[PDB]
């Protein structure tokens, strides 16, 4: 399957509720490690990574992330100055990572942002940094003179893929798991709109379609957002908003498609608290 390794760094100059610098690591967008400037320690967040990497791994990861905190602390005082902002709460964000498909092909990105808006981002096809404003052009010129793209690209294509492959091995049972949705048709009261609810699934790709008389029907449909549950799984719902007289004169069904599986619900399935 397709698997990814990503790191997201949240740095904050003048906040209160959170550490100055937070680092989260994810395989398939699921946390497997954490680090922050309060603990100054990088710790495990999944069993497969703790069973499979000893004290030496967590030591050198903490070292690297204390380097990341310092570089952030300096980095944010400059971008404030370039933007003429000597007062306030400001954020510095960094996210990079890997992708490995079935092809054997690979993809990667390396991106920074200031106050929640694109600052610089790597194009490792051309070994150049895309600046999003004048204030970033100063960094583009500096890093391109310094071979930062050379290092970052070596990381994304080799080092991060090597670590990714070990991680899909360590976590092969969880990471390759395929869990079906539990699907229900919901109704608050006999005239209410009707809701197709799908929950408990992984991976996150789901399709929810409504049907009128056996054919797909995209009128009066409100597809809800992809939301997470408390385990690695996700949920999503869709709502058909038609008057139950159109319910009489037609046969509406919900169809949920996930992985190699398909589930179907009709008016006979409607559950309710009423």
């Amino acid at each position: 399957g397709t698997h990814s390794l990503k790191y997201v760094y949240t740095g904050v100059s003048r906040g209160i509720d959170f550490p100055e610098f937070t680092a989260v690591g994810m395989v398939d967008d699921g946390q497997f490690m954490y680090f922050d400037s309060n603990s100054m320690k990088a710790v495990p967040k999944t069993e497969w990574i703790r069973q499979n990497e000893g004290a030496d791994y967590w030591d050198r990861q903490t070292q690297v992330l204390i380097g990341a905190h310092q570089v952030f602390k300096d980095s944010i005082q400059i971008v404030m100055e370039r933007f003429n902002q000597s007062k306030g709460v400001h954020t510095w964000q960094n996210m990079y990572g890997c992708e490995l498909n079935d092809d054997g092909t690979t993809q990667g990105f390396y991106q920074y942002a200031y106050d929640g808006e694109d600052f610089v981002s790597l194009d490792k096809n051309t070994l150049t940094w895309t600046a999003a404003n004048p204030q970033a052009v100063i960094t583009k010129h500096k890093w391109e003179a310094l071979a930062v793209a050379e290092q970052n690209k070596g990381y994304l294509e080799n080092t991060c893929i090597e670590w990714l492959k070990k991680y899909v091995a360590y976590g092969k049972d969880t990471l390759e798991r395929k869990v079906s949705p539990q699907v229900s048709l919901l109704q608050k009261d006999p005239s209410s709109p009707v809701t197709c609810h799908a929950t408990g699934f992984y991976p996150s790709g789901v399709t929810i379609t409504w049907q009128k008389n056996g054919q797909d029907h995209d009128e009066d449909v409100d597809l809800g957002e992809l939301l997470p549950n408390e385990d690695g799984s996700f949920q999503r719902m869709s709502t058909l908003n038609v008057g139950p007289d159109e319910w009489k004169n037609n046969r509406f069904s919900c169809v949920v498609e996930h992985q190699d599986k398909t589930i179907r619900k009709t008016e006979d399935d409607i559950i309710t608290n009423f």
């Binding site: 690297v64 380097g67 080092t159």
Partner: peptide, 9 residues
């Protein structure tokens, strides 16, 4: 495993 934060902006 995380990469070096190599150079400040």
């Amino acid at each position: 495993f995380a990469n070096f934060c190599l150079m400040m902006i």
